Design a protein around this ligand. Structure first.
Ligand code: 3WL
Ligand code: 3WL
Ligand code: CL
Ligand code: CL
Lengths: 215, 215
């Protein structure tokens, strides 16, 4: 009834895995090969031709952020968004902030030396705004348990750690971002996340390859 | 109770005006000067420091797409999104598609000659996907009346027409995009939109100035 056309490394695919497992939705995970795309993936997502694509009752939903909101409306139990409209708007605001700024992380795969240190400092400033104005003193962006904002920022945990090691730069450190660093550790220790994250060595290998091709 | 920190030319500000007028929400329009920003605008939106910012009961909501969804949840009468989760996901998918591709319109203000003709053809292909897969044979993206998808695409009407005249290129024409061109004419004739759009001559003057500074 529910199929997820995904991958074993994509952070965008992992957002959907987390949301489905939080709702207790049974699904079949179809891991696609991006070099030779299947006919189902091209028929279901003819606009971007990429993963993740959730297929529910034969009907496709593409784009991780679109899929998350579809999951939240379709399986409303164990809510991942607050009920108050102002609180929901603040959640969507921070989700879109991360989605817009995820581009500034691209420079971490391209730049080198005194240019890569400039990109890493810009990434720290992006995360500091998120820490001060978004997280604040809460344990999670969803308060006392993870919500769609935490899920949307999950790529700043082990995927970002892998990018840092592959690029030779530090971005999310306890000295400079104390509350966001504690959040990232707390997020990764949540049993749902801990049992559903790619192996670090495989993720690091992926980032090294991505940095090699993007120079 | 409701204040809108806006401008007389921003298409992003006009999305909010349309949604508020469709809900029948009374509001005070505070037109800001972008060169010398007021202290209220800096306090309400310290992340982007831009308009539109809706302030409801003293609480600020920034980013036009975030404000639209806040308006839809806060004043649920005269719905601007469908009730079915799959239909709502398709609406959000097309809204995010336009938001992501709005960047390809930037080249219309920068490029010249054989480079500007390449940018205009890429814009036509972006609009063709939207026409075939998004609009189809419906009168409006919301079916028989405008919804948040029509509102989000309203910038492709007179703002785009002004960019075309300022740049000396044609993008949305009846021969090449028959259904999207008929939609744009129908949208602009909706009395709510017709009574709430900037004067074309002032909008054209704005685009000419923007193209001049961006060369
Ligand atoms: O666009 C991508 C961005 C990042 C990323 C991770 C952490 C922090 C910032 C960005 O990981 C990725 C991995 C993939 O397998 C893939 O196909 C991708 O497009 C991306
Ligand atoms: O980013 C902008 C994009 C466009 C635009 C309009 C039609 C089609 C595509 C893009 O208009 C604008 C007008 C403004 O006053 C402003 O501050 C802006 O940032 C924009
Ligand atoms: Cl995605
Ligand atoms: Cl906006």
């Amino acid at each position: 009834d529910v199929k997820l056309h995904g991958s074993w490394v994509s952070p965008f695919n992992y957002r959907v895995i987390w949301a489905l497992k939080l709702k207790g939705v049974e699904f079949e995970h179809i891991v696609e090969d991006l070099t030779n795309k299947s006919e189902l993936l091209l028929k279901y997502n003819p606009v971007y031709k990429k993963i993740p694509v959730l297929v529910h009752g034969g009907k496709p939903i593409a784009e991780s952020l679109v899929i998350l909101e579809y999951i939240e409306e379709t399986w409303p139990e164990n809510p991942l968004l607050p009920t108050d409209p102002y609180e929901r708007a603040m959640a969507r605001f921070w989700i879109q902030y991360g989605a817009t700024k995820t581009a500034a992380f691209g420079a971490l795969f391209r730049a080198s030396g005194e240019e890569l240190e400039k990109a890493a400092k810009e990434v720290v400033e992006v995360l500091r705004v998120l820490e001060e104005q978004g997280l604040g003193d809460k344990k999670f962006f969803g308060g006392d348990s993870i919500n769609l904002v935490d899920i949307s920022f999950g790529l700043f945990t082990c995927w970002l750690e892998a990018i840092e090691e592959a690029a030779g730069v530090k971005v999310l450190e306890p000295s400079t971002l104390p509350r966001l660093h504690a959040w990232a550790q707390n997020f990764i220790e949540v049993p749902l996340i801990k049992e559903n994250i790619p192996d670090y060595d495989k993720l690091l290998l992926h980032m090294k390859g991505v940095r090699e091709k993007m120079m």
